[PDB]
Ligand binder design. Structure first.
Ligand SMILES: [Cl-]
Ligand SMILES: [Cl-]
Ligand SMILES: [Cl-]
Ligand SMILES: [Cl-]
Ligand SMILES: [Cl-]
Ligand code: NA
Length: 129
């Protein structure tokens, strides 16, 4: 599924991301735009044997199990397949854990490169949130 911008904002707000661990809602919407282009089935294969999965491009070394990644910790205790679902529930839940690490949203390459320190409230413009 490819989410609309305000469509995704509403679901991310429903699931508690606005201001979570110090990150207002627009940070998460921006991260999804630039990680996955709002595509729930996006994937990115990496050089270390891991893969990034879903709308928030969550990495298979530490966070989900795909059965083929070294250094596996599966700290969200889920199959990586769950992160490719058309509803965002599993991805948002696992992102809460990821962001709770000392890294914060620096865990997201695309947030680091296109969202950090920008006008992230623009991402929820006209959404009524
Ligand atoms: Cl929309
Ligand atoms: Cl939802
Ligand atoms: Cl915001
Ligand atoms: Cl899987
Ligand atoms: Cl990570
Ligand atoms: Na990632």
């Amino acid at each position: 599924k490819v989410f609309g911008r305000c469509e995704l904002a509403a679901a991310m707000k429903r699931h508690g991301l606005d201001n979570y661990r110090g990150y207002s809602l627009g940070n998460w919407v921006c991260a999804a735009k630039f990680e996955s282009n709002f595509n729930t089935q996006a994937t990115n294969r990496n050089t270390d044997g891991s893969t990034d999965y879903g709308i928030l491009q969550i990495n298979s070394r530490w966070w989900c199990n795909d059965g083929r990644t070294p250094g596996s910790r599966n700290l969200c205790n889920i199959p990586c397949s769950a992160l490719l679902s058309s509803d965002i529930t599993a991805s948002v839940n696992c992102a809460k854990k990821i962001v709770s690490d000392g890294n914060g949203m620096n865990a997201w390459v695309a947030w680091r490169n296109r969202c950090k320190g920008t006008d992230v409230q623009a991402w929820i413009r006209g959404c009524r949130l």
